[PDB]
Amino acid sequence: GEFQRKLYKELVKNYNPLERPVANDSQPLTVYFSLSLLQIMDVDEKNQVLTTNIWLQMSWTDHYLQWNVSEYPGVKTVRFPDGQIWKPDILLYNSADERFDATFHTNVLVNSSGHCQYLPPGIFKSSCYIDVRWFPFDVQHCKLKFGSWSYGGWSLDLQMQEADISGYIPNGEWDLVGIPGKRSERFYECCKEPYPDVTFTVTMRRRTLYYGLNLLIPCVLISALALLVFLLPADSGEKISLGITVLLSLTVFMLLVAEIMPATSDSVPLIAQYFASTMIIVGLSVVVTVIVLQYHHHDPDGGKMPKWTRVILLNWCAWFLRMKDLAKILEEVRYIANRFRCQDESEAVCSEWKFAACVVDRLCLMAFSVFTIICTIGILMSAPNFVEAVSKDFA
Amino acid sequence: GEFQRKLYKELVKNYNPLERPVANDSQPLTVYFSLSLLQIMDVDEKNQVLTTNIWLQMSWTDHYLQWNVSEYPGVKTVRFPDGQIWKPDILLYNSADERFDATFHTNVLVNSSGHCQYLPPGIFKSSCYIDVRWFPFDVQHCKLKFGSWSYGGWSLDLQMQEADISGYIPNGEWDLVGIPGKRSERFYECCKEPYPDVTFTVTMRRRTLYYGLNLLIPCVLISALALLVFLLPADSGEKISLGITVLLSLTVFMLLVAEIMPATSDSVPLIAQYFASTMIIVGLSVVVTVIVLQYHHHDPDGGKMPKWTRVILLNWCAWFLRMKDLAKILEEVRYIANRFRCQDESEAVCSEWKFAACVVDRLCLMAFSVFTIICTIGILMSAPNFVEAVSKDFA
Amino acid sequence: GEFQRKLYKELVKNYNPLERPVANDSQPLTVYFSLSLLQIMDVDEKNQVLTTNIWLQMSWTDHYLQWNVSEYPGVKTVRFPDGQIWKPDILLYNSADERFDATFHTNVLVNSSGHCQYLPPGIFKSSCYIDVRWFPFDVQHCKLKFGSWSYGGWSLDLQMQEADISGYIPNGEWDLVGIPGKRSERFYECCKEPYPDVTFTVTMRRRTLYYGLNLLIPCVLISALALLVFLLPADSGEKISLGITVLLSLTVFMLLVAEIMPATSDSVPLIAQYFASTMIIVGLSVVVTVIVLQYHHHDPDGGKMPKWTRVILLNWCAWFLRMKDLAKILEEVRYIANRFRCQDESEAVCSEWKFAACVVDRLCLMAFSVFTIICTIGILMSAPNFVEAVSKDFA
Amino acid sequence: GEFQRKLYKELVKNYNPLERPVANDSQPLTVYFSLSLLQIMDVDEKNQVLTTNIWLQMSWTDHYLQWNVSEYPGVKTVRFPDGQIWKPDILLYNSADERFDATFHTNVLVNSSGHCQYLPPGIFKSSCYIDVRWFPFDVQHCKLKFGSWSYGGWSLDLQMQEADISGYIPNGEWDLVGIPGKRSERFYECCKEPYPDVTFTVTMRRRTLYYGLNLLIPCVLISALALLVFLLPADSGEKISLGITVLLSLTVFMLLVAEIMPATSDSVPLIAQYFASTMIIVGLSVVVTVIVLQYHHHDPDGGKMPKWTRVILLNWCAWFLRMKDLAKILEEVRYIANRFRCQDESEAVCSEWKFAACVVDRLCLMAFSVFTIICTIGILMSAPNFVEAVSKDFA
Amino acid sequence: GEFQRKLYKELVKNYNPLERPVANDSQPLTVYFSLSLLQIMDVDEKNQVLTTNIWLQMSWTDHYLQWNVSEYPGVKTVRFPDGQIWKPDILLYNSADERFDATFHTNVLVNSSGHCQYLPPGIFKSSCYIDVRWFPFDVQHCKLKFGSWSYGGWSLDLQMQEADISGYIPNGEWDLVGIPGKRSERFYECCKEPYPDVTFTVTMRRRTLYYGLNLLIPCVLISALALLVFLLPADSGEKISLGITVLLSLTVFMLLVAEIMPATSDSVPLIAQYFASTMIIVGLSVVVTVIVLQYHHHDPDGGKMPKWTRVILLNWCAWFLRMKDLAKILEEVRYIANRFRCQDESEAVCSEWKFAACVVDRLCLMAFSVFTIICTIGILMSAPNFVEAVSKDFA
Ligand SMILES: *[C@@H]1O[C@H](CO)[C@@H](O[C@@H]2O[C@H](CO)[C@@H](O)[C@H](O)[C@H]2NC(C)=O)[C@H](O)[C@H]1NC(C)=O
Ligand SMILES: *[C@@H]1O[C@H](CO)[C@@H](O[C@@H]2O[C@H](CO)[C@@H](O)[C@H](O)[C@H]2NC(C)=O)[C@H](O)[C@H]1NC(C)=O
Ligand SMILES: *[C@@H]1O[C@H](CO)[C@@H](O)[C@H](O)[C@H]1NC(C)=O
Known part of the structure; x- marks a missing residue:
């Protein structure tokens, strides 16, 4: 359209995909991190890895991507590809994977008030201890530890939202008990600033039929x-x-x-x-x-x-x-x-x-x-x- | 040629591969989605995945890629590579695949009236429940759910065309019964706008010889x-x-x-x-x-x-x-x-x-x-x- | 050298890697397609695929890559990488492969009269029916179907040259009978124009020792x-x-x-x-x-x-x-x-x-x-x- | 923010990602190399390879990435992606891997005084002799040899820091004895300059239960x-x-x-x-x-x-x-x-x-x-x- | 440093990574090709392939990368990444590999007199006939055939240097007898010019313990x-x-x-x-x-x-x-x-x-x-x- 062309030509002007999109540089950027579990693929006792199908969910607020709807009465949302706008670097810490990412960066949806949304789907391979003492009557507890790679608590502070298990497609061999989350803070002896993370514990029970x-x-x-x-x-x-x-x-x-x-x-x-x-x-x-x-x-x-x-x-x-x-x-x-x-x-x-x-x-x-x-x-x-x-x- | 060189230099001028190619920004862009099944590769009961050889078919109408044939009496179609013109982001929702896409983006054929055509071939891996109660006299129903990743019903509304089974190359182990399609709309409690999708149900019967x-x-x-x-x-x-x-x-x-x-x-x-x-x-x-x-x-x-x-x-x-x-x-x-x-x-x-x-x-x-x-x-x-x-x- | 530097700076000037290199835009571009078989890797009866080591051979005539040898008395051939000159999109139709291409685009050799030559080596995976009724005294007929993805008969008309079997490295398990080729034309009910293709039938016999x-x-x-x-x-x-x-x-x-x-x-x-x-x-x-x-x-x-x-x-x-x-x-x-x-x-x-x-x-x-x-x-x-x-x- | 935007626009000006960031060109650049072992994946006696999950740690001092905090009272650290600032080419010499790198280059954290830090996580595949004479009562000694690919001792001199074994996630089949490091210098008959390297010897014992x-x-x-x-x-x-x-x-x-x-x-x-x-x-x-x-x-x-x-x-x-x-x-x-x-x-x-x-x-x-x-x-x-x-x- | 920055800004000026770096365009460019064998991975009799760990070695003389050390008294060598300077296209002819290259292009070291050195490490998969008549008392002869893909004998003439077997890491199952090399010339009925190549014959004996x-x-x-x-x-x-x-x-x-x-x-x-x-x-x-x-x-x-x-x-x-x-x-x-x-x-x-x-x-x-x-x-x-x-x- 004639309006969204000039809006796209206007938004990316004087924009840097490396700066954190805040207005004061001293205030943290609140990022709401969630998770959506789709299915459990395999549980390997040989290498002690867990393969799952997970859809991450991220949501933050940008400041340089705001426009008035009145001047663009046909545009309400815009989408940017990977590498053109700032995105948080939240990734799995365990990630016992060859390429370590397995994320498939999709487009990023942005509202007209700067509210940005982004959910990349991928298959993750975490590394957890599997206790096989009571095989085949065992119950496992595998952890998924997410967090920012290079941002502190005063720049990008993580928040947690309850995981979603709708559409679980039961495995048949492993029975899921639940998946609760928890947010923790790790302190270093450098700076007295928190380093927040979000971890989800997947509790599953083996079927003995x-x-x-x-x-x-x-x-x-x-x-x-x-x-x-x-x-x-x-x-x-x-x-x-x-x-x-x-x-x-x-x-x-x-x-x-x-x-x-x-x-x-x-x-x-x-x-x-x-x-x-x-x-x-x-x-x-x-x-x-x-x-x-x-x-x-x-x-x-x-x-x-x-x-x-x-x-x-x-x-x-x-x-x-x-x-x-x-x-x-x-x-x-x-x-x-x-x-x-x-x-x-x-x-x-x-x-x-x-x-x-x-x-x-x-x-x-x-x-x-x-x-x-x-x-x-x-x-x-x-x-x-x-x-x-x-x-x-x-x- | 001397004419198609200036036509190519003319078409890409002031063109943005991120804007939706419409003329009013308030009217939906009609995209006709179809499918072509080539063969069934494997049906895995371990991870509950289905591997098929499928050729997608997409067809929409562009507005900035129109030219008069009289001024270019030697050119009737033009072709653009991946990343130079706008393309819909229709992809498989299930997609129990490592890279999640498996599409192999080819060129996009465009007529002189703006009618664009695009069909990427690839091997897909869907995730469906396999009921094995009556093995080996079982019959399966696996679903392929396609839809737009980040476009609503007022921007990109999907239409459905009947799937093609010509050139099926019978598997030998699994017998195909049919593959009907259906278009559905999912509503959210945000906006009262449809979110259309196209799903194809592959019905197959196991051979017991x-x-x-x-x-x-x-x-x-x-x-x-x-x-x-x-x-x-x-x-x-x-x-x-x-x-x-x-x-x-x-x-x-x-x-x-x-x-x-x-x-x-x-x-x-x-x-x-x-x-x-x-x-x-x-x-x-x-x-x-x-x-x-x-x-x-x-x-x-x-x-x-x-x-x-x-x-x-x-x-x-x-x-x-x-x-x-x-x-x-x-x-x-x-x-x-x-x-x-x-x-x-x-x-x-x-x-x-x-x-x-x-x-x-x-x-x-x-x-x-x-x-x-x-x-x-x-x-x-x-x-x-x-x-x-x-x-x-x-x- | 001092001459080939200015020749390279001269050839790519005002050049578009998207236009078909012809002089009238209404005349077909003759592309001579051949094939060279190196060895047969595996024949899978499970998924019905055939893996071969094949060196394609393509040869066409360009028009914008012509220069006089007298002004460049030290240059006779030039080479361009992938993505800088126009190349035909001939690829295997069957191609039961994950990435569907398996081609490894090499450089393109060009003579001083515009005659361009290009031969990419790769490992192909075709999909053919394997009839196993008379196992292990069976004989197979697998097809390799090549053709242009998005060019008609009035733009890029394929020609066929006899396949080369020199340096065959016999498999040991499968015995090759021969590999003849054939060029066919497929008509649609749109335009009354041919859609040529080149297909090679690989005939092989199983060894029963x-x-x-x-x-x-x-x-x-x-x-x-x-x-x-x-x-x-x-x-x-x-x-x-x-x-x-x-x-x-x-x-x-x-x-x-x-x-x-x-x-x-x-x-x-x-x-x-x-x-x-x-x-x-x-x-x-x-x-x-x-x-x-x-x-x-x-x-x-x-x-x-x-x-x-x-x-x-x-x-x-x-x-x-x-x-x-x-x-x-x-x-x-x-x-x-x-x-x-x-x-x-x-x-x-x-x-x-x-x-x-x-x-x-x-x-x-x-x-x-x-x-x-x-x-x-x-x-x-x-x-x-x-x-x-x-x-x-x-x- | 308004300050970090101009700081990012200021840092990359007249910057070359190919020059070694020193101030005299005759003084070595001190790079502190460390290692962090996460787990042992597999030990293959067939091909004699060792698969481990290792987080490298590198730290050097840059000279062109220094800024005064007073003029930017909201910025203390900056991050650059792969390919925009100079990075040492330290990599595993053995590296019996297909792609030979397996590193997953992440962002590079830089302080306000030019002190740069960088730690890429990856899965490495070293090649070591496995002596199986006393199977299953054997003890192995596998080496990990790191060093610069194309820098001498007068340009990039490696230093060694003790490896970290916190968070080891015991394998269950192999018992870890320890992992000491050593820095050596190799001389050539060309130049009389050292070629330092850092090698870590992983000593492990097989469990015979x-x-x-x-x-x-x-x-x-x-x-x-x-x-x-x-x-x-x-x-x-x-x-x-x-x-x-x-x-x-x-x-x-x-x-x-x-x-x-x-x-x-x-x-x-x-x-x-x-x-x-x-x-x-x-x-x-x-x-x-x-x-x-x-x-x-x-x-x-x-x-x-x-x-x-x-x-x-x-x-x-x-x-x-x-x-x-x-x-x-x-x-x-x-x-x-x-x-x-x-x-x-x-x-x-x-x-x-x-x-x-x-x-x-x-x-x-x-x-x-x-x-x-x-x-x-x-x-x-x-x-x-x-x-x-x-x-x-x-x- | 202040000098190597201007040297890097000086070398790449008016430089083309596609021209052969000679001074007359009629004289061959001498390229010294060698090889370094690290270990033998596997010998497959099913597909008749050989997997080895090999470090190639190439060395030629450039003409546009010469500078006087007096004006740059702190710089003696420079390094360029892949795709910024001309490199020979020597690659394995057999190369029974999926991607056909398996080379991992590293940096290229250049002296101050234009002498360029380059050695890419990789894992190669050649295709050789394995004669199994006298199994398990057999001896094999597998060939590795290297040569330029698109350069003749009057442009890039190969020379051969003796292969290096230091650091061989004996396989344990196969015993290496030796690895001699040979340079041959192939003539075509077009031009009466040689097409040199370098081939290494790996002779190995099976261990019968x-x-x-x-x-x-x-x-x-x-x-x-x-x-x-x-x-x-x-x-x-x-x-x-x-x-x-x-x-x-x-x-x-x-x-x-x-x-x-x-x-x-x-x-x-x-x-x-x-x-x-x-x-x-x-x-x-x-x-x-x-x-x-x-x-x-x-x-x-x-x-x-x-x-x-x-x-x-x-x-x-x-x-x-x-x-x-x-x-x-x-x-x-x-x-x-x-x-x-x-x-x-x-x-x-x-x-x-x-x-x-x-x-x-x-x-x-x-x-x-x-x-x-x-x-x-x-x-x-x-x-x-x-x-x-x-x-x-x-x-
Ligand atoms: C920038 O960060 C680096 C991170 O290492 C700081 O280097 C260390 O700083 C501490 C704090 O005084 C010292 O105790 C260490 O000795 C430093 N390490 C080294 C290797 O010198 C550096 O000081 C920071 N700079 C500023 C201005 O904050
Ligand atoms: C730049 O480096 C190259 C590396 O090969 C040098 O070439 C060798 O230099 C030694 C030292 O005199 C000679 O003995 C060899 O004969 C040279 N090799 C060849 C193939 O000629 C080259 O001399 C160096 N140049 C400078 C100016 O230092
Ligand atoms: C560089 O170091 C040398 C000796 O290491 C010294 O003579 C020279 O003055 C230094 N460069 C500068 C610019 O001071």
Whole structure:
């Protein structure tokens, strides 16, 4: 238009994009800083970074960009590109990013009274400590620290406005609890002037449904399947063939486990100690099976039974469980009869060893059942906010 | 040429690339916005982003770029680079991209009557919720929201033209249903002026052929192979050796399953519950086998059979299935005869236990056959648009 | 030098880098477009893109860059950077690239008669459909479509020169057949003027040596190893232990298979149906083995043999294969004799079941040998250009 | 403000951003260089690079940027963007980075007395040798070498200030020992002038908790589980079925091992030789088992025992371990009696072979127990700073 | 300073950064090109690219940048940024890079006599053929071809200086042999003028320690472990259970093999044929075992032995190996005696089949031992420079 052309030619005249737009040079320039969270992209435990989609919001008052609407009855707002008017240098302090800015400077909207508004959208990568001790029942607290790079409290004093979470697009894997802000002042031993900053703490909770369905169920099933070894009869030559195949399947399942579990060495994740306890239980099952088989295959050369060994496994442990011419012909045939009698005596004395082995199997079944139930329940129950996690996620 | 040189020297004189090219400053500038879809690149369920190849199309009318063709009888169109003439700032609102623009500003074609045309090609990355509850029989609805960044409805009012799908280059994995557009207006509690926008909804359907050939076939084959355990005779010492090897193969197959299934914790995908049901069936087969083997290896010390146990497995379940001097010589030889008689009696009483075990095996075969058929059919049939998916993809 | 300084100061005077360098403004500017292929980088079936190393070649005639050599007896050529002289905007239409250009604008060489030459080197990413139906015996046809972005046929008319393949640096995985070009004209219903373009079709053939050595050999070996089950004698309790271990090895081999086979759902690759047929054969071997073992372990309670079952497996199938006081003493000893006689009769009647099982094993060996030979030969032979692929690659 | 506008218009007048800001041109310009470490991102053994988050700090004195505060009673500091005032070109010499700079030039703060301050934040990628001989008990020494690119010691002489480690955000995987600095001078055979530089040596120690819990525990468990083979009785046909299944599980565990262990060929990592020793032990267990089984299944055709073989395994090795009409009737019945007697003699002579096999099993159990204990303890104990690593990490 | 300010204001006056800085325009400008190698980053066999860290070195003589030191007694060198003085356009011809330059133009140092020096550091990505026929005992020859983009031999003639390898930071995986240079001239059929270039050939040798410890050792161990099958006695039902478990472990080991071996189809790598020979040997072991077991389980219905079969396996092959009233009572008891006699005859005739099976096992052990020794030694020894590789790497 004919009016906004002369207004644009008038505004930029004798204008310097390096001076702070104030009227006295001794008064602070009030900048209202806010934030708008759009979504959470990824949370990396390897490099300890947090990727979010955030729209910043800045608003200050300029003094050299004021005009009377009466002389320009068709113009109410003007827009300037990046590098033609003064802009505050507020940027993320953490900013664990390659280019460190990730801001995409857009145009700057200015009203007719000098009130300037500016909101650059970008994807930020902050650096926060991730505590993985109670994985996967953990809760994180990551900080976003904004502030001016080279302006003090007497030149550009930051103010804070509540963050906006409208249009959050829930992540699905992480659940957002809230995002409060806080303004602080840092003093140096130079000048006795404040250095204000605005920090937003993003509090988020991990969802434990995918892990509880894809890691807990197969581990519990394999651990309970490993206990069937004691139920098998020793006559079938398939006891070790099951006891070691379960362990092989656990080893191949740890391959799927590995790609998920974090590799931090600061502490021991709860899922790691749970899987290690399960693995130790399955490992000791084979040793118990080996001892039971060493007791079942009793060669007929080691007596009947030691008194100390018998008096326990057949009287006390079995009580707790409630198991419960013609002369040559005569000499030729009585030898066969006595041979059969002696073989029957040998098999009768060797049957009790098999019965003791069955008793030992039942004892080990009870002991390992209570071991695995107690370990599996206790390890998961010991974690904090477990009841809150199951109540929110599962139910 | 001698004429277009002076025309170029004439057009840019007293021209400002920051003013909106209108003649009254109070009338809106009509901008016709369209879209051209070229292909769909990827659909990421991890970060919930959509990558597409899109050619935008913009068209407005300028006022300071008009010239009479008679004075320039060799020039009909002129082209200006980026940053020399006014261009609308229409850009994607979602734009889950690193640089947020991905536009590649090209030249701007202008006719001799001021009609300007401009179409920048680029690859866009929108952010949409992906609902994976019915994976792999799901249908998605992703939105592309375009609009002016800093112009109101009284300055730059958007119009919509139907999107073009000519030259679509079908993806192969995702099937496009359509892409309709809609223009909406958003009001603020400041000014009572519209803020128009143009949004395009991309509706696409997943193709279920690769999954139905590479995941369903091996799982069905393994599940049906696990049922052969009951058909085996108990004499061969190879029953557990098959029952647990099938489970080991299922565990190693879950490794291939894992890289495909999504990791979202918002809901349970249908393929996950189908594979979990198959795994539970294969797991319980081993427990049934253990009980059957515990019944086959009956030691000759526990009586013939309890009446309650016998009267079922041999009379009712077997009816439903329709299974159906010389004194010393005499004393020495009659002992052998009676020993043989007693051993034959013992083996005769122990044969019925094996027959009961065979009956139990047949019952478990029937029960597990109907269990696996019902589960496999029901889980897949319960999903919506399943008949549409199979009719379009397979047939 | 003293002369080229004044020549450079003379050429750029009153020069506009936006005007088309012609002398009448109504005559087309002839631009000769060529191409030089250096190597093929990658062919992606996931996103359907093609990455190549290409050196474009452009050549046109300028009019404002002419000088007489006599007045400058030391200067014959001059070079201008990007953005100081007019350059055609020829660029790839497909260009499935992030920045869409990938050109690296170099200097522009100009002769003393105005003949300008310019060749920018870059790495291009085109988008072409990849048909994977006959994988790995497939042949592709990918297109590279070049043309002016905003110039018509009456302003900038493209000409085509044959592509150069000198210095091709063969890929090793893909074999190049050729690269012919073609110039076409597209008409619009506006102006009745041509819109010329130049397109190059890159025809390439996949090399089938790595696949034929790393996928076909192990699959054939495993499939032929699975047939040894029928050769084993039934006395050894190791028949299922081999039949199911072969299947477990096939399942773990499919993990290596998975990372190679494409994931397109448009059609069924030939390697997928070949591996599926092999897997189905190995699966049915176990069912046949289960039936054979169910026939070998015949309990002595089911008669001798049904007439219909016997008359086939022992007369017809066996013919086709060409298998082929003292009273008490007497009562006490004749009982033992008759017991031995009856046990011998029972074992004699039970031997024929084992012989029938051996006959069934031989029949199944022949049937499965011909099944696997026919399937393996037919699936590979059915593909087109198979004889050409083996003749070129292997021999 | 009205004063800082004229101050900005005054400072840049007759100013050249290419001249070194001194007053005599023969005196060096003192530049104080420091460093601030924020975190360690990654340590790559593949390409031998180190990624860190570092905030440089530079401080020099300018001469043309001095003004009197009395004439500008509202201005105390001024800020200039990149490219408007002279800045030193100090940059990382190693800088194994794509763009080689990674600096993100910010504004430059200047006091009223000419004292200029400038601190650019960025992510650096240095190149250092990583010695992996004692993995995972290794300690590294990576260098960061800073210095001027094109200024000598008589123009820009570097000074060093102690690095700051406040706000270190511990990595979790690598433990920082310290970061001392040093200033050195390099002389050339041209000019006899120093070329100063500032180098910082980052000393870090690897944390051995994740490896000690996820690699040592399963390997020790599998190695000790492989020793149960000797404890098994030979009657059960399951000895090889365990001895080879343990080896199969070790082979599948090496897959998880592979993704962690480095691929450098300069030396042999300690974890590689430990896992190789474990694998060799498990391999030789099967050969010992094969020999034991070849001794257990003694066919009754090879005599009783060779004297040299017997006199050891039953007298010395067993002492060290402390194992410890009527004529036809008579001819018909005495033959049966003698046949039974001869069969009993044969089984009695064949029992001693089984006893010798048990003795051999016990000897091999003791020998392999001491072998595996000595190897496992010695390999880990031989590494340096092992006691320091366990004392700091575990306890 | 006061002098260098006027010197900088004097040098750039009437200066053009596009003219070649000579004094006659007909004389070539001598440019001395060198190179400095810092390290080798990666060698990719997939795309056939080579990534190196290289510092170029250029040096020419300018004519318009000369000043007398007496008039400027404080200035000896001046520095100009990129784009203010003329620089040669020497760049890598291969340059298989995205941006094709990767140079990071730094400042240009100039002496007081016009001697200009310039060395830009960068990371280059060349494209060279990698011959992988003798993997992992291969030696490569990759070329780096530098030259002027648009200057002939009569304008800018290149000279070559020997490359510098001081500070090489050895890679660890690749061993550098040397890097010689060569200057060549290319003539066109236009002008009869040279087009000089400078090319450096990087010769490097692969280190075979990691492969020789992580691939050769497990393959040899598994191959030698597979031979124990023949040593086992046939009485134990565990022969196939070992023969097929070894093959399963080999199949799972090929998964680790796959990620390392290249995927080029140009030729067959030596490691591929070695692993294939090992796999074929292990495969044929199972077939031999099946035949041996088919000979061990001889049913008592097929005669004693065919003469041709016996006369070899028991006379020749066993010689080469040096294996070596009362009437009813009488009728009732003589039947039992004759039954025992006939059963003893049957077992005596069936023992020789087992002995022949043992002889066959020993023959197959010898044959397969020599097969595997010859194959394993020959395949590795056939490669060139094998003795050099082992002498340098291992010893
Ligand atoms: C301008 O700022 C600089 C910042 O370093 C001041 O330099 C320091 O000033 C303090 C205050 O007296 C001294 O104690 C230090 O010794 C100074 N540092 C050095 C390296 O000399 C400088 O004094 C300030 N100038 C004015 C006029 O305020
Ligand atoms: C300016 O610097 C250049 C740097 O190369 C000097 O060139 C070398 O100077 C040494 C010193 O006499 C000679 O030995 C070499 O032969 C020169 N190199 C060449 C290629 O000629 C140059 O002399 C310096 N000029 C002045 C005036 O100091
Ligand atoms: C510069 O320094 C030198 C000695 O360092 C001195 O002789 C000379 O006078 C100084 N310059 C001025 C202008 O004082």
